[PDB]
Write a protein that binds this ligand. Structure first.
Ligand SMILES: [Cl-]
Ligand SMILES: [Co+2]
Length: 297
């Protein structure tokens, strides 16, 4: 069940336990949780930001709710204030929503960066590794996770009713298996140099190395990209969806105007830690893949 549909239409309403169970079981099983009627409205003063020209240097404007810092956009103070207010509101509403929906995670949900993506996808072209029209799990070379989960909330806020077209691939375990023969260890000492040189924020654990390998090699495997099991789904304007994007194989084909909020979650906070990419990889390679892993007995 690659996509599980939910009826909630409000960012603040509570959920029954039955729905909460459906959500956490589906999320940890690698399904997309889809809320077709959960729209994120914009203020009239914010409608002018539905314009790709606000991006100045990147493809995404980003906000850190922890430090209240806005990046990727230039402009006058009042416009940066309004744009910060938009992404701050998305951070607050998605954070509240996740705490209503996933009480099992308690305070282990750690907010990370917000993004606003106003560039139309179909006009994109880049290196194969960054080509997000290729199925992948998320792994960022500059930002290792140390095994923590990448949990994202997405909202399509296109004002012309245009959907956001995704493809959703096969289960992580199948992906990992398919690509395993292609995986290779890192060159001795290399990850330490990337850390020493500031190329990576923190140290790239073995887990992060292998997720990058999956990410990259998977994107370069053209036969896999063409022939592997995958479903195409259009997320309508005014909808929201929630995904462990380090686990759900995904790709975007077209669309414009997306709000996205990233959260991090430690593996030990999961209901079924054994379903995590970390544990699956540690089982497949029979080794500990993150060095400061808490030790248990
Ligand atoms: Cl529901
Ligand atoms: Co992605």
């Amino acid at each position: 069940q690659p996509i599980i549909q939910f009826d909630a239409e409000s960012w603040e309403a509570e959920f029954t336990q039955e729905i909460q169970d459906k959500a956490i079981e589906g999320l940890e099983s690698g399904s997309v949780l889809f809320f077709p009627k959960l729209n994120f409205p914009l203020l009239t003063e914010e409608l002018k930001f539905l314009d790709p020209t606000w991006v100045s240097g990147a493809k995404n404007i980003s906000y850190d709710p922890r430090s209240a810092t806005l990046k990727g956009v230039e402009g006058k103070s009042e416009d940066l204030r309004l744009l910060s207010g938009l992404l701050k509101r998305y951070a607050e509403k998605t954070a509240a929503f996740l705490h209503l929906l996933f009480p099992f995670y308690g305070s282990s949900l750690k907010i990370a960066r917000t993004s606003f993506r106003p560039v139309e996808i179909s006009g994109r072209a880049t290196s194969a590794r960054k080509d997000d029209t290729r199925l992948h799990v998320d792994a960022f070379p500059s930002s290792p996770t140390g095994g923590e989960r990448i949990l994202r909330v997405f909202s399509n806020i296109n004002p012309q009713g245009k959907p956001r077209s995704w493809r959703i691939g096969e289960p992580f375990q199948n992906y990992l298996n398919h690509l395993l023969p292609q995986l290779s260890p890192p060159a001795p000492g290399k990850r330490f140099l990337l850390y020493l040189f500031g190329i990576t924020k923190g140290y790239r654990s073995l887990y992060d190395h292998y997720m990058l390998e999956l990410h990259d090699k998977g994107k370069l495997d053209l036969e896999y990209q063409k022939n592997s099991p995958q479903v195409a789904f259009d997320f309508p304007a005014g909808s929201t969806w929630i995904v462990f994007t380090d686990q759900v194989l995904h790709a975007v084909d077209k669309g414009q105007f997306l709000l996205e909020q990233t959260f991090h979650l430690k593996v030990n906070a999961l209901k079924h830690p054994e379903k995590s990419p970390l544990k699956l990889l540690e089982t497949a390679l029979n080794k500990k893949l993150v060095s400061s892993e808490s030790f248990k007995l």
